[PDB]
Structure 1
Amino acid sequence: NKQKQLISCGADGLIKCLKTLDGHNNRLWALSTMNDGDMIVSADADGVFQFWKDCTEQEIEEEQEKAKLQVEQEQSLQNYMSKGDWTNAFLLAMTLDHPMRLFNVLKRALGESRSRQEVIFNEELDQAISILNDEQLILLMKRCRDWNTNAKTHTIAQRTIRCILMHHNIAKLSEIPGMVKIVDAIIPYTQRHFTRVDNLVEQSYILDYALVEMDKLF
């Protein structure tokens, strides 16, 4: 159509460079591209054919349809962060992979879970974290791993690890490829936090010693 051109038989038709096509299994003596403007491109191996589609404008509409989708359901997550209802906020921040908003939805849902009253979040949120697949739970535990390295943000990470452990299958969690380099990374952080909170609760009994002194006062 003016200036880019097709060539054959690397094992494949290639256009001018960009867009290595599917090709074949072996060699090739074939190009017929000569319908209307530049329509159906027949490209043939020894036996197998391909009838390559059309002017390549189909992909751009598909390419321009995702960005519109992502900017649409980015302005649903902000509305959910505004008005609460943290479950679709959770799964949609998992879909967008927005990490500090994920920390915010888990932290404020955890704070209101501490507020009101087996279940550690609201039950619709922990079934929503129960029904998520391997890629989502492995990235969720990637960032539970890196949240667990603090002494401040560790509790949200520990309770997300807890609900994953009690809402998924343990053999499945082991067989997911990648989740043995994560749990090795954040077992010893849980160990030092356990020693620190155990030391804190053992030095918590000066209140009890002060009570028994205050009772021996009279």
Structure 2
Amino acid sequence: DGLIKCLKTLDGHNNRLWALSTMNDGDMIVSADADGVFQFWKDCTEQEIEEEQEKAKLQVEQEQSLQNYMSKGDWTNAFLLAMTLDHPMRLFNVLKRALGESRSRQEVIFNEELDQAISILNDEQLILLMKRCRDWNTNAKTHTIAQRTIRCILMHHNIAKLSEIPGMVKIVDAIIPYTQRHFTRVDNLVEQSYILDYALVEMDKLF
């Protein structure tokens, strides 16, 4: 194969190589040949870091927009910033905060624009959101957020698509049994909630 100077091997060939021609202008396209197969190397590091620094500029502007949203409110665009950035702590906090304020204020489970924004999203964002839902469900403290997000995914998406994504049964086998455990536990809290009903019938019998 070819090497540069003790670093940066190249893709290679299968056999011996008596060929190197770097004799372009500064050092443009460089040639290197095996017995028969040719190789044409491009250029200097002028755009394959320029792309890196412009996507870094976009990343530092959209991370700052996520901080400003997570400050001021507007949980929906903060949510899609968290999904595009894969910031899971911020994603859990925005879903918890939006769920709690939807509990306080007044089919629809988050605020209407947020759960429409969960309806519109693609298969890659949906599979990473269900991965986060899968391991928020393994608690018992942070499982309510996970169950609400599972509910909006289920009642806002197409079920045949949800099934036929590759990877969405190796998640739903991970959050059927934790949900079955939680359904048993919350059902048992309902069942042992009847000591208030018993204390009421004793306080009524009282006289």
What TM-score, normalized by structure 2, do the two folds share?
0.86
In structure 1, distance between residues paired with 2:166 and 2:86 = 20
Distance 1:71 1:190, change over 3 A: same
Offset of residue 25 of structure 1? 11
**Residue 207 of structure 1 pairs with residue 187 of structure 2:** no
In structure 1, distance between residues paired with 2:122 and 2:15 = 39
Distance 1:120 1:40, change over 3 A: same
Offset of residue 145 of structure 1? 1.1
Bigger mean CA deviation after superposition, 29-38 or 59-68: 29-38
In structure 2, distance between residues paired with 1:105 and 1:199 = 30
Offset of residue 142 of structure 1? 1.2
Distance 1:17 1:126, change over 3 A: farther
Distance 1:74 1:36, change over 3 A: same
Offset of residue 82 of structure 1? 0.8
Bigger mean CA deviation after superposition, 105-114 or 122-131: 122-131
Provide structure 2 residue ranges, at least 5 long, that are not aligned to the other structure: none
Distance 1:16 1:135, change over 3 A: farther
Distance 1:32 1:174, change over 3 A: same
Q: How many aligned positions are there? A: 207
Distance 1:26 1:189, change over 3 A: same
Bigger mean CA deviation after superposition, 131-140 or 29-38: 29-38
Offset of residue 53 of structure 1? 3.4
Q: Deviations over 1:96-149 (max 9, x none)?
A: 111111111000000000011111001110111111212211111111111111
Q: Provide the secondary structure at the position in 1 that maps to 2:36.
A: coil
In structure 2, distance between residues paired with 1:163 and 1:28 = 60
Distance 1:172 1:25, change over 3 A: farther
Q: Deviations over 1:26-79 (max 9, x none)?
A: 998865432211123356799997754332321111122222221221111111
Bigger mean CA deviation after superposition, 107-116 or 171-180: 171-180
In structure 2, distance between residues paired with 1:100 and 1:54 = 41
Bigger mean CA deviation after superposition, 14-23 or 151-160: 14-23
Partner of 1:8: none
Q: Provide the secondary structure at the position in 1 that maps to 2:63.
A: coil
Offset of residue 20 of structure 1? 5.6
What TM-score, normalized by structure 1, do the two folds share?
0.82
In structure 2, distance between residues paired with 1:118 and 1:17 = 63
**Residue 47 of structure 1 pairs with residue 36 of structure 2:** yes
Distance 1:164 1:46, change over 3 A: farther
- Structure with the higher helix share, 1 or 2: 2
Offset of residue 215 of structure 1? 2.3
Q: Provide the secondary structure at the position in 2 that maps to 1:58.
A: coil
In structure 1, distance between residues paired with 2:135 and 2:47 = 41
Q: Which of 72, 77, 87 is the aligned partner of 2:66?
A: 77
Q: Which of 52, 55, 61 is the aligned partner of 1:63?
A: 52
Q: Provide the secondary structure at the position in 1 that maps to 2:39.
A: strand
Provide structure 1 residue ranges, at least 5 long, that are not aligned to the other structure: 1-11
Distance 1:75 1:50, change over 3 A: same
In structure 2, distance between residues paired with 1:90 and 1:26 = 53
